[PDB]
Design a protein around this nucleic acid. Structure first.
Lengths: 166, 164, 168, 96
RNA sequence: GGGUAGAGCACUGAUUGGGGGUUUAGGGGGCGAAAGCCUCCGGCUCCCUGUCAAACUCCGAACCCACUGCCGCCGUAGAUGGC
RNA sequence: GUUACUCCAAAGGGUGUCCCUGGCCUUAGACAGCGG
RNA sequence: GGUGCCCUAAGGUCGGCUCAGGCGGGUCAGGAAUCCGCCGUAGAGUGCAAGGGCAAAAGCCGGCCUGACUGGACCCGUAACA
RNA sequence: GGUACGGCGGCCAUAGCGGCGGGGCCACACCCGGUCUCGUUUCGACCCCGGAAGUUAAGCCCGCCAGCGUUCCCGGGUGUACUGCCCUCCGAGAGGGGGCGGGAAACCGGGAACGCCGCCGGCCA
């Protein structure tokens, strides 16, 4: 809770979290085999080029020609993340929920809306500095439960960052 | 670790320090190894030979024994090791870089270049080194416009003077 | 079908594996527990085999019906936990009769392989129905291919057949 | 039906491992050396497919009579016949 | 060096019943204002109970095989071996 | 029965006789008679 | 129970990475699949049957190549011993 | 002689997995930037380059926990199951018995175990 994250900040700010990253996707996915300028939408929105991601075993909604441009994905770091959050959070409803969250402190939004048709998905995930020793190559090793995140620190971080919750 | 049919890997592989495939390939040669290691702040070099009870080292040297972390320091420590390897009566060795990726233009191969120049026969290519403007120091001195290469020169000639 | 002196011996190898046996049949027997299945009774009347046998499912089902009818008519469902412990796994085969050219039997049925002094079936009861449990024992014994014998078991794992028989 | 002998016939167990070895062997075995006259046990490591003798002769003890490349020359006796094999040191083990 | 007998369920696959939790992959209806908030025959994950394997193995004999040294036997009255 | 083997019939029953055991009775028990 | 083939890559080598499934998060009728995190000894995958083998790989993603060559030698198996 | 420091190894779980508590000259990490070396089918996240304001929180070092998994020991199970050689022993047969030799698996109870060894270095005094 508040006392918790503030007293372990007092302990040290290395225990205070940062923001890991923010990833946008066209989740449902309706490109097909044409040049959807939903990729062009995000170009102007964010300021750097997206990337496709190809389908898998054959389906009906979209993604039958396995190995086919079907959707769009973008991943953002640093200050761009804060800024686009200030944009989209503000855009969308008051009173962020509590069940926005996975049980590590990461949340997701399912928002929607010449060309302007789009139903999008955003996902934000969090971190604290020493999450590197699990993704690094040399002397790799996994994170104990202390240096891991729970639901509280996530929601409190969301509040302090920008929001009020359920 | 969850019962039988679970294979626990070697100590140094669960640690994350040794690559046993590459180790085999290097040991198939019956020649000493010039081992090179890199931290954020120092560089280490050794010359190692094989024993089944445990590898036996013959030589060592260190950037702190220089201070008494960068490409210049790499070259200088290469010079060190190349000049001590002839002291003991061996002019041959093959490069060991463990789990360091082989990018061209790195302090690893700077150590290699130094060891070659200092009179040690290590088989090599000439197109893997870092070029001399990154070696001598023009690179950080060009960055400082937003190690003095004379100092580089002087401690270099100090080493060659010492080991004449 | 054929007599059981053909199939009671245990000298052939085990022949159980369904993913390699083609044309294998299904079990005629489907129920294996009966009565009150939680009542925490006192006495366990169990049958044991004298020597090793192969018991057919036809016989197993005959025993099932006979014994359960006796017990339902003279004890009542709320007592008499009845159980058959052994499932029929071994596949019986017969030679489709040419003559002895290409003799390797086609499947015809199933049996359970029971070893010396191995429990076949059990009836859990209370003090005042032992005689009916023993009647079930005798009815069952009469319908098997080789001989069997019964024991009476207490909680804690003890054999009490001597004295419990004496007092009656 | 009559079936000829081949390299991998009835090798299910003999070229299998216990699942707690499961991988690359340690390197001492790869780097063993031998002298002429030394007795050696023929013990096949099933993860290394070079220098592999016919598994028929797995479990026998022969003598070294030389080297050719990285392989050693091992003689065995089969009945009255003497037979000669070129075996990688990983498939070998010294007596005593 | 080896996986047979025996044994067992740790893999592959078979197999009884109970005590619970998620309920639903799914046709049945019920208060079904209708696939509904909610349940009924059923699927998923446990724990206790009971059964199996010629083409299963966490285990594992007696026994057999090669080799070294010794005891014993054969051999200069010529063996083993070769033509 | 007078059969080592080559070359000998069961499930199920009898306490027919000889034996080893375990419980309930026994200064009056299991009946056998006169009576309630 | 399978074969009487297929591949200029499914062949050679170098580098980097790690799989199936389950759970918790979101748009979706079964949803095939695309997004995020955790667990996870290989349950996956391997040109093809079955068995064996393989995890900083023998699997996935890429880069450069043609040792799928010329001249020769001694060994093992088919066909134990012979 | 000392150091709560590091590199290359061997045996490959009695060493693992997990949990708890403690530490920072030297050192080892995390940390800030990315112009340049190298690169991201998008992100300097990971790989690479440059350096330390700053942190003991993680990794690392140090000590503990018998919770899971693993190996060993004593005793029971039990000389049980199985088995090599001989038998004018039994049994209608199957299948068992006797003598001389070998000898388990599950399970049960009680103990040890939260790594051992080699080579060269660094820093303080």
């Amino acid at each position: 809770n508040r006392e918790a994250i503030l007293a372990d900040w007092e302990a040290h700010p290395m225990r205070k979290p940062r923001i890991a990253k923010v990833t946008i996707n066209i989740g449902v996915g309706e490109s097909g085999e044409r040049l959807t300028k939903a990729e062009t939408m995000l170009e102007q929105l964010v300021g750097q080029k997206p990337i496709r991601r190809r389908a898998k075993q054959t389906n009906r909604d979209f993604g039958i020609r396995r190995g086919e441009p079907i959707a769009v994905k973008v991943t953002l770091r640093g200050e761009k993340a804060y800024q686009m959050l200030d944009r989209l959070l503000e855009a969308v409803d008051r009173k962020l929920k509590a069940s926005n969250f996975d049980e590590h402190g990461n949340f997701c939004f399912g928002i929607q809306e010449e060309i302007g048709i789009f139903g999008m998905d955003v996902c934000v995930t969090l971190e604290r500095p020493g999450f590197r020793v699990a993704k690094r190559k040399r002397q790799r090793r996994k994170i104990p439960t202390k240096h891991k995140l729970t639901k509280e620190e996530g929601i409190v971080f969301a509040m302090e960052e920008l929001k009020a919750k359920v | 670790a969850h019962g039988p049919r679970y294979r626990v890997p070697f100590r140094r592989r669960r640690e994350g320090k040794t690559n046993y495939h590459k180790r085999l390939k290097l040991l198939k040669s019956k020649k000493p190894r010039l081992v090179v290691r890199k931290t954020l702040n120092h560089h280490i070099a050794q010359i190692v030979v094989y024993d089944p009870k445990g590898d036996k080292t013959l030589v060592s040297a260190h950037t702190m024994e220089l201070m008494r972390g960068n490409t210049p320091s790499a070259y200088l420590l290469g010079l060190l090791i190349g000049y001590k390897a002839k002291q003991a009566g061996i002019e041959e060795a093959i490069l060991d870089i463990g789990l360091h990726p082989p990018t061209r233009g790195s302090s690893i191969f700077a150590v290699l270049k130094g060891a070659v120049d200092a009179g040690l026969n290590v088989p090599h290519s000439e197109e893997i080194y870092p070029e001399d403007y990154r070696i001598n120091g023009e690179h950080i001195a060009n960055y400082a416009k937003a190690k003095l290469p004379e100092h580089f020169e002087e401690v270099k000639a100090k080493i060659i003077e010492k080991f004449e | 079908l054929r007599p059981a002196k053909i199939d009671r011996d245990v000298d052939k190898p085990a022949y159980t594996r369904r993913e390699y046996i083609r044309g294998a049949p299904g079990p005629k027997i489907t129920i294996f527990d009966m009565g009150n299945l939680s009542a925490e009774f006192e006495y366990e009347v169990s049958l044991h085999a004298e020597q090793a046998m192969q018991i057919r499912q036809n016989a197993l089902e005959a025993i099932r019906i006979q014994v359960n009818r006796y017990l339902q008519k003279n004890v009542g469902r709320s007592n008499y936990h009845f159980k058959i412990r052994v499932y029929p796994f071994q596949v019986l085969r017969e030679n489709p009769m040419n003559g002895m050219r290409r003799p390797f039997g086609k499947p015809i049925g199933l049996a359970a392989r029971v070893r010396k002094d191995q429990k076949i079936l059990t009836v859990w009861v209370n003090g005042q129905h032992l005689k009916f449990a023993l009647g079930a024992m005798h009815r069952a014994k009469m319908k098997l291919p080789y001989s069997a014998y019964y024991r009476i078991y207490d909680k804690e794992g003890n054999d009490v057949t001597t004295k419990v028989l004496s007092t009656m | 039906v009559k079936k000829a002998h081949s390299f991998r016939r009835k090798t299910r167990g003999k070229l299998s491992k216990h699942p707690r070895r499961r991988g690359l062997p340690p390197l001492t075995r790869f780097l063993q050396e031998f002298e002429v006259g030394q007795k050696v046990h023929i013990v096949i490591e099933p993860s290394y497919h070079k220098g592999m003798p016919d598994p028929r002769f797995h479990g026998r003890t022969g003598t070294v009579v030389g080297k050719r490349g990285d392989a050693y020359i091992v003689q065995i006796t089969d009945g009255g016949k003497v037979k000669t094999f070129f075996i990688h040191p990983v498939h070998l083990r010294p007596q005593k």
